[PDB]
Amino acid sequence: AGAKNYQYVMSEQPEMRSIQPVHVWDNYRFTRFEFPANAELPQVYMISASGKETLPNSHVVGENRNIIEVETVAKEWRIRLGDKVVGVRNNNFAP
């Protein structure tokens, strides 16, 4: 337990607000994503060192399992689900 740094930014679009992630915070070990309880949990991708999107091993936690803990830390996250997408970017990078 110490001082963590969670600096994220997501595209502000009222159309993709449905899958819009509530809040996001990472850690030196793993990263967690908080999503609405009334909404569905989408799949969060990550931009590999190559240039394409890759789906990292995700996990589910929380009192309602509305959280998604990904086993990796990057600077660019691509949340996709159904026919909507929400671009997220981490401006800090602790690890």
Binding site: Y8, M10, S11, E12, Q13, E15, H23, V88
Partner: peptide, 22 residues
Amino acid sequence: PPPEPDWSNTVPVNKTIPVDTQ
């Protein structure tokens, strides 16, 4: 319709900040 993140107003994902006031 095609979503695509236009980053129109680019809204952060940290507003509440989990710190738990004591």
